[PDB]
């Protein structure tokens, strides 16, 4: 009843029902989202006031399906899921150390042994006819180049190893879905993230047992997930940070990849646009240099506006302590408030023709979205690892725009799911053919 005064109803997804809630409704509207109220709140009038701001922190009711599923902790209190301030204060900027400049840069080469390895084994079978699901190559690129680079360990699912590991993933993310929006699957859910903390405990134990032995280690992210731990009395807060970053740390990255391979597959136009650019920028080297990155002007705006249309991580929440008024809307105190950057990409208030994949919303010349987008968020909650995904990101796809042409199977189609986070419904299977055919 205290909300019953606001707006709102008395391969499609929930957000596509928030979307089109708040066109109707408007820019306050009351939802019913993870079991509980909300209100999304959709002018960039809100955006701002709420997230640029230390006084508005997150809803911890709004991630109890990240920190624990069915009684097995998963994210526990890690970056992402620990809702006081000064507790995740403290993490991040510890954490930060392993995102600077210099960190970035030397993972260069992480990122492109793991690119040159997709490419290569999608060379082999790109004879126009074997159909290959980019979704699921993608995925394991991601996963090998995270291992890799935060952990210093090699996955190898590009060599069709740690399927274990895949299941275990794939469970748990339902998990946290069933929970937010029987009995085997429970026992399927538990055991899969049991295990995802059992691999955390070994890679821990594989590191100290290194260390103690006066191995060479170098810096990494789970030397600052360690360093964040020093005198802590157990390792659970060192669990919940390494399942942490191991799933944050592929998953939307993932996600994006799949979704722009998907929409490029119907944009002949655009992808010889930007097969031109990498030719004309990396020619015919093997290697992406960091400065190369930065020349890819055109491959920037084409992830940019992928993640326009189709972002992973649709938004966040803040939880509003006191009685509000938001865009003429009176907001009771204690109420989880919804941002979309998913909902307001597909707004024609805030994107003329917001269904068109236009690459040249992101050009120099043109006016910036103030507000209006954010895919990794924005202000102090804002994704640490964005320069991280930016980077592996624009050398996957540079290496794939050089090498190979991609063809969607028909059949194939263009819808979302949520499983967590939004990814494409169908695996993305293409036929593939070398540049030049
Ligand atoms: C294209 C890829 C990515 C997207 C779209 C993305 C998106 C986001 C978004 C929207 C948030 C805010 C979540 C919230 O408020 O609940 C976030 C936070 C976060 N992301 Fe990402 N992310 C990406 C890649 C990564 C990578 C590569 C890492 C780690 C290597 C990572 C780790 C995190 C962490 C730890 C947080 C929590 C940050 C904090 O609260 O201090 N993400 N990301
Ligand atoms: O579920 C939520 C909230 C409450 C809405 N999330 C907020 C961000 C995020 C990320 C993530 C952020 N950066 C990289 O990955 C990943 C996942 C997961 F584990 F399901 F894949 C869930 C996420």
Same mark, same amino acid.
């Given at each position: 009843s205290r909300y019953e005064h606001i707006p709102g109803p008395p391969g499609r997804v929930l957000?596509?029902?928030?979307?089109?809630?708040?066109?109707? #409704?408007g820019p306050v509207v009351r939802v019913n989202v993870f079991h509980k109220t909300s209100v999304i709140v959709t002018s960039p009038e809100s955006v701002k006031k709420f997230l640029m701001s230390t006084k508005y922190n997150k809803d911890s009711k709004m991630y109890r399906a990240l920190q624990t599923v069915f009684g097995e902790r998963l994210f526990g209190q890690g970056l992402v899921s620990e809702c006081n301030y000064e507790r995740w204060h403290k993490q991040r900027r510890v954490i930060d150390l392993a995102f600077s400049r210099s960190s970035l840069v030397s993972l260069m080469e992480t990122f492109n042994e793991k690119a040159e390895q997709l490419v290569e084994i999608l060379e082999a079978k790109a004879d126009?006819?074997?159909?290959?699901?980019?979704?699921?190559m993608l995925t394991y690129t991601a996963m090998d180049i995270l291992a890799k680079a935060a952990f210093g360990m090699e996955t190898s699912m590009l060599l069709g190893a740690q399927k274990p590991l895949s299941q275990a993933v794939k469970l748990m993310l339902e998990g946290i879905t069933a929970s937010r929006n029987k009995?085997?699957?429970?026992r399927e859910v538990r055991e899969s993230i049991r295990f995802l903390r059992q691999v955390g405990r070994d890679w821990v134990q594989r590191?100290?047992?290194?260390?103690?032995?006066?191995?060479?280690?170098?810096?990494?992210?789970?030397?600052q997930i360690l360093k964040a731990e020093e005198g802590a009395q157990d390792?659970?807060?060192?669990?919940?940070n390494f399942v942490t970053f191991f799933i944050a740390g592929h998953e939307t990255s993932a996600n994006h990849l799949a979704f722009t391979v998907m929409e490029l597959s119907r944009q002949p136009e655009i992808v010889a646009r930007l097969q031109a650019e990498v030719?004309?920028?990396?020619?015919?080297?093997? #290697?992406?240099?960091?400065?190369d990155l930065g020349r890819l002007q055109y491959l920037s705006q084409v992830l940019k506006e992928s993640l326009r249309l189709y972002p992973?991580?649709?938004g966040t929440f803040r939880l509003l302590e006191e009685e509000t008024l938001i865009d003429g809307v009176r907001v009771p105190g204690n109420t989880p408030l919804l941002f979309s950057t998913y909902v307001m990409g597909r707004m024609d208030t805030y994107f003329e023709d917001p269904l068109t994949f236009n690459p040249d919303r992101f050009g120099p010349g043109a006016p910036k979205p103030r507000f209006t987008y954010f895919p990794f968020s924005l202000g102090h909650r804002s994704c640490i690892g964005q320069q991280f995904a930016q980077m592996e990101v624009k050398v996957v796809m540079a290496k794939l725009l050089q090498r190979l042409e991609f063809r969607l199977v028909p059949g194939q189609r263009f819808?979302?799911?949520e499983q967590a986070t939004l990814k494409p419904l169908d695996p993305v299977l293409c036929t593939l053919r070398p540049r030049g055919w």
């Open positions: 957000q596509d029902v928030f979307l089109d809630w708040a066109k109707k #409704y126009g006819q074997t159909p290959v699901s980019m979704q699921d009995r085997k699957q429970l590191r100290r047992e290194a260390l103690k032995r006066g191995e060479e280690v170098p810096a990494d992210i789970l030397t390792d659970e807060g060192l669990l919940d030719d004309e920028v990396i020619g015919s080297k093997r #290697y992406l240099d960091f400065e992973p991580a649709w819808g979302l799911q």
